[PDB]
Every structure is written in structure tokens, then in C-alpha cells.
Amino acid sequence: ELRVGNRYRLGRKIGSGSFGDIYLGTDIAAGEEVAIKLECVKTKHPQLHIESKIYKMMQGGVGIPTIRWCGAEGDYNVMVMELLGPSLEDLFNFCSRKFSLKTVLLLADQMISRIEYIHSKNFIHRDVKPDNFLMGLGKKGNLVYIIDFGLAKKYRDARTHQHIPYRENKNLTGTARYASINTHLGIEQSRRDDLESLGYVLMYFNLGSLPWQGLKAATKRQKYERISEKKMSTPIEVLCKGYPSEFATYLNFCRSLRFDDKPDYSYLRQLFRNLFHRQGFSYDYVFDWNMSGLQSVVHR
Amino acid sequence: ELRVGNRYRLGRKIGSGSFGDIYLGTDIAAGEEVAIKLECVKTKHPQLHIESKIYKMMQGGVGIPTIRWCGAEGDYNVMVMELLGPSLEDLFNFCSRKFSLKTVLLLADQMISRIEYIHSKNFIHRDVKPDNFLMGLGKKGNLVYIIDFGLAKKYRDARTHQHIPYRENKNLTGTARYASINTHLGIEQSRRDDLESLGYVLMYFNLGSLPWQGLKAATKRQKYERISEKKMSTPIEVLCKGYPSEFATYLNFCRSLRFDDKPDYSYLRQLFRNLFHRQGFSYDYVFDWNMSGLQSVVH
Numbered sequence: 205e206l207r208v209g210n211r212y213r214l215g216r217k218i219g220s221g222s223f224g225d226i227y228l229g230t231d232i233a234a235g236e237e238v239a240i241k242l243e244c245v246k247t248k249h250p251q252l253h254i255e256s257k258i259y260k261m262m263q264g265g266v267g268i269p270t271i272r273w274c275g276a277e278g279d280y281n282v283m284v285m286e287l288l289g290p291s292l293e294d295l296f297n298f299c300s301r302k303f304s305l306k307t308v309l310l311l312a313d314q315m316i317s318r319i320e321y322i323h324s325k326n327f328i329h330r331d332v333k334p335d336n337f338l339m340g341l342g343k344k345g346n347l348v349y350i351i352d353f354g355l356a357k358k359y360r361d362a363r364t365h366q367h368i369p370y371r372e373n374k375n376l377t378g379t380a381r382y383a384s385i386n387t388h389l390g391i392e393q394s395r396r397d398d399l400e401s402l403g404y405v406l407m408y409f410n411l412g413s414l415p416w417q418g419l420k421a422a423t424k425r426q427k428y429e430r431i432s433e434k435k436m437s438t439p440i441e442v443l444c445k446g447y448p449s450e451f452a453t454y455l456n457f458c459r460s461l462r463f464d465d466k467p468d469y470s471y472l473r474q475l476f477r478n479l480f481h482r483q484g485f486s487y488d489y490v491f492d493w494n495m496s497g498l499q500s501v502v503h504r
Numbered sequence: 505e506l507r508v509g510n511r512y513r514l515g516r517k518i519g520s521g522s523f524g525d526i527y528l529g530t531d532i533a534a535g536e537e538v539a540i541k542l543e544c545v546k547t548k549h550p551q552l553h554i555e556s557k558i559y560k561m562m563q564g565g566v567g568i569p570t571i572r573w574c575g576a577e578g579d580y581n582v583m584v585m586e587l588l589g590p591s592l593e594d595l596f597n598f599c600s601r602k603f604s605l606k607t608v609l610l611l612a613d614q615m616i617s618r619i620e621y622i623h624s625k626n627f628i629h630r631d632v633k634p635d636n637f638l639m640g641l642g643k644k645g646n647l648v649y650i651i652d653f654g655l656a657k658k659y660r661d662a663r664t665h666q667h668i669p670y671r672e673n674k675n676l677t678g679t680a681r682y683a684s685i686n687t688h689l690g691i692e693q694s695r696r697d698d699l700e701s702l703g704y705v706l707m708y709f710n711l712g713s714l715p716w717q718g719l720k721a722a723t724k725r726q727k728y729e730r731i732s733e734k735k736m737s738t739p740i741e742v743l744c745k746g747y748p749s750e751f752a753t754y755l756n757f758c759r760s761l762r763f764d765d766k767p768d769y770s771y772l773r774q775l776f777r778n779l780f781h782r783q784g785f786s787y788d789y790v791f792d793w794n795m796s797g798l799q800s801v802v803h
Contacts, residue, residue, distance in 0.1 A: 205645050206598075206793045214598070216590045216638065218518040218528070225597070227590065228518065228528065230537075237528075237537055244600075279600055290516045290527060297525070298514070300544075300579060338516065345505050422722070422796050493506045493514075501797075 208282045209273050212238055222331065222354030223251045229284060231272070238272060241283040245276065251354055252281040258327060258353040259285075265321045267314065267340075267349040288349050289341050293334035299492045301412045305448075307492045308409045309480045311337075313473055314348035315405070319398045320469040322350065326362050330393050331355040331378040332401035333502065334408070346489040359394055367464040368392065379502040380431050381417055382408070385459065388432040396461035399472065403455040410447050418498035427504050450479045508582050509573045512538060522631070522654025522803060524552055529584060531572070538572060541583040545576065551654045556583045558627060558653040565621050567614065567640070567649040588649050589641050593634035596709065599792045603709045605748075606785040607792045611637075612706050612776045614648040619698045620769040622650065626662050630693050631655040631678040632701035634708070646789045659694055667764040668692070679801040680731045681717055682708075685759065688732040696761035699772065703755040710747050717800065724799060731800075750775045 206214050208229065215228030221241065229240035243252040253274075262268045273284040292311065296303065303311075315337060322329055329336070331352055340347040355377050360367050371392035376383055382404045384397040408414050416434035421427040440459075444452040454475055461467060480487075506514050508529065515528030515537075524543035531538055543552040553574075562568040573584040592611065596603060603611075615637065622629050629636075631652060640647040655677050660667050671692035676683060682704045684697035708714050716734035721727035740759070744752040754772055761767060 205642065213641070214590060216518060216588075217594045217597075218516060227594070228537075235535070237530075242598075288516070290514060294517045294527060297517075298527075298542075341513070342505070420796075424797065504797075 207232065208240060208277050208284065209275055211273060212240060212284055214240060221352050223247065223249075223255075224354070228287070237287045239285040239287045241285065242280040243283075244279055245281060250281065252283050255354045255356070256283050258356050259283075261327075262322065262325055262353075265325070267318050267347055268321070269338075269349055269351055285351075287341075288338035288351070289345065290339060291335050292337045292339075292348075295339070295491075295493050296334060296409065302492075303409045304492050305410075305483060306480070306485045308406055309476050309483075309485065310487070310489070310491060311348060311409070312402075312406055312476045313480075315350075315402055316399070316469055316472050316476075318348060318350040319395075319402060320467070322356070323359070323395050323398070323467070326358055326360050327353070327356050328359045328393055328395060329353070329356050329398050332398050332405060333379045333382045334405060335502075346491075357393075367394070370463045376428065380428055380504070381414060381500065381502060385432075385436060388435060392463070394463055395467050396458050396463075396465065399461075399467050399469075400455065400458035403451070403458055406454070407443055407447070407451060410451065413498060413500075415443065417500045424504050448479050450475050507532065508540060508577050509575055509584065511573060512540060512584055514540065520803070521636075521652045522551065522555065523547075523549065524654070528587070537587045539585045539587045541585065542580045543583075545579055545581060550581070552581045552583050555652075555654045555656070558656050559583075559585075561627075562622070562625055562653075565625070567618050567647055568621070569638075569649055569651060585651075587641075588638040588651070589645065590639060591635050592637040592639075592648070592705075592709075595639070595791075595793050596634060601712045602792075604792050605710075605783065606780070606790075608706055608709050609776050609780045609783075609785070610789065610791060611648060611709065612702075613773055613780075615650075615702055615705070616699070616769055616773050616776075618648060618650040619702060620767075622656070623659070623695050623698070623767075626658055626660050626665075627653070627656050628659045628693055628695060629653070629656055629698050632698050632705065633679050633682045634705055646791075657693070667694070670763050676728070676801075679803070680728050681714060681800050683735075685732075685736055688735065692763070694763050695767050696758055696763070696765065699761075699767055699769075700755065700758035703751070703758055706754070707743055707747070707751055710751065715743065718798070721798070727798060727800075748779055750779045 212229035212231055217225055218228045219226040224241050224243040227240045229238040231238055256274045259271045269288055270286040275282050336352045338349045338351055339345055340349055372390050374390045374392055382401045384400040387393055387397055415438055416431045419430050421430050440452045440455045511532055513530035517527045519526055524541050526539055526541045529538040529540040556574045559571045569588055570586040575582050636652045638649045638651055640649055673690050674692055682701045684700040687693055687697055715738050716731045719730045721730050740752050740755045
């Protein structure tokens, strides 16, 4: 039988993240299903080892998946993770790409906290998107996890908290649909960018799509410049038309942070909670799922 | 908790197939992982019920996955299958898109037999491709399963074995990379076409790609016509150069079958079995792994 570490039976391919492929594994010992990330040993720019060390640093955190086994096996470096539930993208499709306001607000509160936890451990994620949040299982089914640290980077020194320097003339690392405008402008990413990306994620939940998604461009790579122009020519008040003003206030706050500003996460949470109460919502962990067209691409 | 059939925990998305999605499931009672096919009820061209009906007909069969539950929940029709192992496309990538000859012959023998079982149940698969073959688990880990009957069709009457009638001007149903040439020409599919596709799969395992794969076309009506034009303009003796003649003999035999001919599966298997024997491979069932862009038809 085919195993990694002689511990995990390899299953079918279930995805393809930042740098590597992800398959479904079965812990032979316990029987528990796992996720198995593989990276070819001569990937020019290896990353699975660095990602695993990031995961190991975050281990204690609420909504941080457990890393079970690292090692090298044949043509591959191997990272075995705890398997979680469906991604927020998965649940979005399941609910026919419409989330209620309450499900969006429930999710907003946890996702802000997740990003703050990463930042508190001195890292920025740089790939905030529906695919990189998964719900937990069974009793953890109401818990939003954040995954995929393959694009994560240290933003400040662990000892001195000296911020990495401001920089321009960068190329995009993450997903074009949710990148911050300053990322579009080539500026080094920092904490504000994780949070601004979340802001586009939340508006993407409210709308079913974003206005720069599925832009009908034939040639690729120039596709990137057209997202940026639509994103820059769409005011946040127009993007957020038809929805509580809190979503525009959130985005304006994120765009207004300076490069090395510490975000006021407590504020951003309060901005949503208060609206949550005004709707008469109870925190009962009841999400929507408890009850040609657009073919856009995150890597083009 | 979100459940399907009040029995199965919904997991992440692990793919898409014929026309519907599938997310890893967990049987609440047993804990066993399952595969869950979902199809929106507001579909105009639905098949999950027809597919699940084909599955029920095949149930006894070697290398045929078990249906566990089938039903409707909310905006979706549901089919719960036994979860199997990785696809042959998945294993191919794992082995860095290189299979040894012994693994190709091991796969060929079972794959002929899978197709023959389907044909014996009066059906043609019509979407033969690596992605639609999965290995089993644990004790059945050396067993090749065939999956996804969304494009399957009855080719002969169950009672009389009258073959369905010949037809022209059909549109392409499956995946362009592995379609028989007659499918490209618009001709109704029959048994020969499943086997011809297999022949392309086998050469694809040997080569790492097919010469009509990744053809650099921009439009789309064009890219399929260039696949069709490249496939037809590559003689089988050129496709198979450098490999035992059995791969060209298999493909020429498939291209020569008449529309309603019963394939001589026993011959096609023997051809590879005799090759296996002359190579001196040990009969141990050890596979290699135990030691607006371009669209090529993902569906």
C-alpha cells in the first residue's frame, strides 16, 4: 500500500494550494482522515519546509489546524495536516452563492480574529480568500479555521517589533480578485492588506461576485491590469451599494491604515457586532448551511 | 450540523465530474468516509438520477463502487458513493508522469476487463479517461475501479441484444483528448470507442502526454478542431513509436472494429499478457507507486 511516513494512506487529489498539491490521507493508526500536502523536492524555490515552520509556530491558536507529520519521501517533501470541513468557498457554492447577512456577520467576527491572531504571532497571511478558511468538524463545526501559509511572511521582528521596510515595485503574490489596492499598486504588504482583502471577501459574500470578477479579457496577464483598473475605478460606496454602511466603513478604515499601522481589530469587530445586534440576530451558531456565466480564476 | 440524508457529514470539495459536484462525506453512524455527488434540482439537463440508476444495475461488479444512499435534500439531488482511492491520473502525477511498462500492463489488463463488464451489462461508458479510474482501498488497493456513468448510454437492448442504430452528426460528449476518432467525426459511439479511448490512455501513460494535448489554440471551436485534426493526422505507427508493437496492434484493432462488432476483449488482454510474460516481470501486482484559457474538456 502507498503511504507517507508509513502512517498515512494516500487518497485522491482534493485540491492544489499555493505551492504543491493536496491529497486526502487516512491515518492508518487512528483511522482519522488527514490532508496531505506534497511538494517536489526540486521546486526551484522550496517552501513546504518554511510553511511547516509557520504552522508549527501557530499551533496553539484558535482555528489553527494541527500539523501531524513532516518529512521527505521520494520525489516529495510531505506535510500532513488535520483534515477540516468544507471551505467557505465550498459552503458559498453549496448555498447557491448567497449568504444571509447574519452568516456574513458571524463569519466576519471570526475571520477578523483569525487574521489578528496571525499578526500577533508576527506574520501576515497575504492570501486571504474564501478558499483559505475552513469550518471545523463535529463539535468544532461552528469554528472558522484559517489555512495555507505558503505565501505568509514575517512582517515584524519577533524581539524588537521593528516593522519590515516600506517598498514599491512589487509583483502580486496572492489572488487578484481579493488583493488590496496597494498590492495592485505594487506596494509591500502588511497587516492592513490581510484586513482589506477580508473586506472584499465579505462584499463577495454579500453580492455573489465582485465587479472585477470574470472580466471578459481574452489575453491573460493583461487580465491583471484590468482587475486593478476596475477595482480602482469603483468607489467603496458603489461597491457596497445596497448593504449596511458598516461594510464600506470597514473598507475605508482598512484603506486608511498606514503601512506599519497596527490595525484596530477590536474596532472592526465592534463595527459588525453592533450591526449584528441592530438586526436582532442571536449568536446561535446557526449558519445558512445549517438549514454562459462567470468562470473566474484566482491565479491568472 | 450540516448533514445529507440526516446521515452524512459534508466535507470539502474534492472535484467535479460529468455534470455535478462532489464533497468528502462522513457516515455519521459508521465514521467511514464517503463521496457525495450533488446536482442542483434547477437543472435543465440532469443526470444524477439516471447515473445512479446505472450504478444500481452494476452493483455486484468487480471494481464498481457501491452506492450507499441516493436522494434529495434542499436544492440538490444526492448520490452517496463509496469513497475510493486516488485516480489513475492522480497516481500518474504522483509518479511524476512516468509509469513503467509493467504498471502500464497491469493497468491495461484490469481496464479492458472493467470496460468489458460495463459492455456486458449492455452499456457503453463514453468517457474513458484516467480521471475515471480509481484504485480501491486497503485489501482492495490493487483493484482498479471505473467511475462516473453520467455519459453512459445503453448500446444494446437488455432482452434481445439488438444494437442501437448507427447515427451521424452527433456532438462530442466526452473529453476531447481521449475521444475516438469516430467520435470526432460525429459518429454514434459503441463498444469500439470505449476501447479505442483506453488505447489512448495507455499510450498517454507511456508518453507523459499525447501529441494533440496542449495544442496552442486561442478560440475554442478551433482548439477542438485542432485536436481532431492532429489526432487524425498522426498515424498510429507514429503515436506508438519506441514502444512494443502491442500498443499499435491494440489501437489498429480498435480502429478497425465495425460499429456494432463485439470486441474480442480476450484477444486484447492476451496481447498484453503475452508481452508481460516476455518481459519477465514478476506476477506480484506491484505498481510503480508501491515501490478564457485552453479547454481540453475537463468534464
